[PDB]
Design a protein around this ligand. Structure first.
Ligand SMILES: NC(=O)c1cccnc1
Ligand SMILES: NC(=O)c1cccnc1
Lengths: 501, 501
């Protein structure tokens, strides 16, 4: 009875999976799997993320990854739910005994093993992940042979560099040499601290608790002065245009750090990371904005970190409780946060306006209602409807209309089924072709969205031809929802679609 | 088959089945003599029908016809459909895939197969997303048997603009914005006349460049004009209610005023429909309407007339300073219509941010229950449930510090091992501890950041050791904590749930 996905289940000889292991168990675990649940994964880089010292999960040492292999035949049973009660129930299992202890018995292995020596349960690893998680019964797991994939400690590297440089292999991609960056950062911090112009600005410092608005002003001056050093010249150029990367934001960052780091915290890397990790504005130092990692060479990353460090040094006497943190634990900790965020951007992910990820802009939030909505099926005659959610954060903002791609016969707008519903008020639309690759639909009643007022734009397409829409044929890959008017232009809210079938 | 397109449970046979039809001006008398002609449309909701009665040539601001009640004699079958797709429906219902659906629906054959003894079949579809109304689709031939009665003629009410239509709709909600627009019109004109004579005001006017000037200089003048203007006795109340909320400050009135002058040329000024089109796509209207944070604050006839009277005066002053009479004529007429539109939205039942799948938008974050079912915590059974919350942010990396989960002794506990947060697919386990007041605090074991292109799925797992139904918890919300910002607090992102079963 179906809590079990047949199509993703199978039997396999020498079935292997991966298990991330904490420091102090790497050698130990190779001697065999001892305790039901023992977890493994088909993805060794995801395995790696489980290797960090449990006493210091944010910043601790990473242990390693092992490959575990069942000799003989192994049944991998893929499940559609992770609800043990449903599972115990739709498989005629005993609803009293645990699930995993049951999958280890011969009775269960007989009925679901298909001839295999044990069953291993399979689940989706995580939302937004295509990896797989295996749940193994402890008894059956004593059969596994264990082999070393990598020990991060034998690597001899600082912080969690070995773990992150490993994961970064998944994408062959931000693949930085953190050893190079560490040394360059150290060098630049030292060089900065000697510079005549900078030592001077420093002496212009009130060197005592001042108001936040004042410390910021000084730090903006320090930043401007420091950014003229030859060692930060590349950084001067790359931070030159984007508002996120401006001195004011470095200043706000330094001030913020100074405010939260006490002595107890300063003196411990785990506690320092915990405290830094919850601050806003880190994107300014990382050079991360608009969905891209701009600071993506060792040289530029090290410059930004050096600058930030000198600035945290300045802000401490100004707003800090600290009577060297800036050059020690602050550097070590921020390096960790760079690596966490870089790893995120390295992972396959849907961009705003793709699938059901919201597109967030000018106060609006819009999204395809479901994944299927974001798909425009082709190669048949007939209708399809596509729902887009629209709201705004606070005050009422208008929706002027919507730009829809068109192809004669293959994709026309159905003028009478296309509409926009505002808190249930159905508002028909007036659509007129422009380009002939684009139709513009305006609502026949004013549309506003805001806190408490949401809309569902329902796009209806009609296909007179059975011919498939081809690769180089669609003028755009997005639908353009137009917000308020602001040369006069409209706030542009994009939902990206895919042509399938 | 048929079960795959017809909703058996929501279908019925009814005697003297009635529905409503919105009729355009000029047809309110002619329609009462019978329904004649691809489909005839009606609805179970007479206020929704009202929305369809506006002059097609002037959709935005034209005259409203009326509403009629149409009744079939004897027995009628209402056939509720699960899909609105003609092809799917003709197929699964084994119809002629070549003829129009509604043509076939009106034949003897079809009526015998699906009418259950009724004299005809009417099709039923959800009226719209976010609405609980129903849309009826009627065959033209069969529609001939309909007797037609007047429900309301909006023209006999002989009121100005669309007042009669909107005042009728507001009856849906007996809370409810139910304004007398006749009084607002009278009060408005009366105050525009009073303000325009005032010594201090008339003065302030002659102090104006009365010529094309930059935007920053017109804004300054209008802000000044605003403050002077606000001290008039007749705008006394307005003075108090716009005192504290920054949305309502003079700066925003001037921004609005300047916006209106910039976009209204002579052609537009001379036409109400064109004026409403131009006005409807401007940002900032919440400043005039007094609408913010999910509430309509300007909800008395007096206070609305004051706000409108002020904006008009201000647009009048902005026109010589940044533009190309209209200020007291069409601008008033048009903005009145827009108030009525947004008011009607707020009167309509809708989900507030963070309820069901409506997103909660705050401090750069967007969070939402992933599906409706996630937002429900089922009760009255022992065992597990899981709850998915989408989390992202608009631009730079912003942290998620943790989550606050409501609990109940032995009725609802947090399953610590299943609860986790996945960041672009990286599954991050959580450290959860019960704190004071029946709340469990769970913080991630690796730092979490979200931003453009980085999203998370927070997966909350509850466990119930008792089968005792949960009776009327401390909170009705889950508190996702953002970045840390008197005292140190975290950004609060609330997801609201319902207890059912
Ligand atoms: N220790 C692990 O590698 C692991 C894999 C999957 C789920 N949980 C833990
Ligand atoms: N004119 C109408 O009342 C109407 C009802 C439902 C749908 N479309 C039009």
């Amino acid at each position: 009875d179906d809590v079990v996905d047949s199509s993703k289940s199978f039997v396999m000889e020498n079935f292997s999976s991966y298990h991330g292991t904490k420091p102090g168990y790497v050698d130990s675990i190779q001697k065999g799997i001892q305790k039901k649940e023992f977890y493994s994964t088909d993805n060794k880089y995801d395995a790696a993320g489980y290797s960090v010292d449990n006493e210091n999960p944010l910043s601790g040492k990473a242990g390693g990854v092992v490959k575990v292999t069942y000799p003989g035949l192994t049944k991998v049973l893929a499940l559609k739910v992770d609800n043990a009660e449903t599972i115990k129930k739709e498989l005629g299992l005993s609803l009293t005994e645990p699930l995993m202890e049951q999958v280890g018995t011969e009775e269960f292995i007989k009925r679901f093993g298909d001839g295999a020596s044990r069953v291993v349960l399979s689940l989706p690893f995580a939302e937004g992940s295509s990896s797989v998680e295996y749940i193994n019964n402890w008894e059956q797991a004593k059969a596994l042979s264990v082999e070393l994939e990598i020990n991060f400690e034998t690597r001899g590297k600082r912080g969690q560099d070995a773990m992150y440089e490993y994961m970064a292999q998944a994408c062959a991609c931000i693949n930085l040499d953190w050893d190079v960056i560490r040394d360059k950062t150290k060098t630049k911090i030292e060089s900065l601290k000697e510079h005549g112009p900078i030592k001077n600005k420093m002496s212009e410092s009130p060197n005592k608790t001042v108001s936040e608005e004042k410390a910021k002003q000084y730090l903006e001056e320090f930043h401007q002065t420091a950014l003229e050093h030859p060692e930060l010249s590349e950084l001067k150029t790359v931070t030159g245009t984007n508002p996120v990367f401006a001195g004011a934001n470095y200043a706000a960052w330094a001030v913020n750090v100074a405010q939260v780091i006490d002595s107890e915290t300063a003196d411990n890397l785990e506690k320092t990371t915990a405290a830094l990790s919850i601050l806003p504005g880190i994107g300014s130092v990382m050079g991360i904005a608009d969905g891209a990692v701009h600071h993506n060479t060792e040289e530029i990353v090290a410059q930004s970190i050096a600058l930030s460090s000198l600035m945290v040094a300045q802000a401490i006497p100004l707003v800090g409780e600290l009577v060297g943190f800036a050059a020690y634990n602050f550097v070590e900790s921020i390096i960790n946060l760079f690596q966490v965020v870089h790893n995120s951007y390295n992972r396959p992910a849907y961009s705003p306006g793709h699938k059901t990820q919201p597109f967030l802009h000018d106060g609006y939030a819009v999204s395809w209602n479901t994944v299927e909505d974001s798909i425009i099926r082709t190669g048949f005659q007939g209708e399809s409807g596509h729902d887009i959610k629209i709201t705004a954060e606070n005050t009422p903002l208008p929706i002027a209309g919507v730009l829809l791609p068109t192809i004669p016969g293959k994709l026309d707008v159905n003028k009478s089924k296309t509409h926009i519903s505002v808190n249930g008020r159905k508002i028909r639309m007036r659509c007129r072709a422009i380009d002939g690759d684009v139709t513009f639909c305006r609502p026949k009643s004013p549309v506003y969205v805001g806190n408490g007022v949401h809309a569902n734009l329902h796009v209806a397409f009609h296909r007179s031809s059975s011919e498939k829409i081809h690769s180089n044929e669609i003028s755009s890959d997005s639908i353009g929802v137009l917000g308020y008017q602001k040369t006069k232009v409209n706030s542009k809210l994009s939902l990206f679609f895919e042509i399938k079938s």
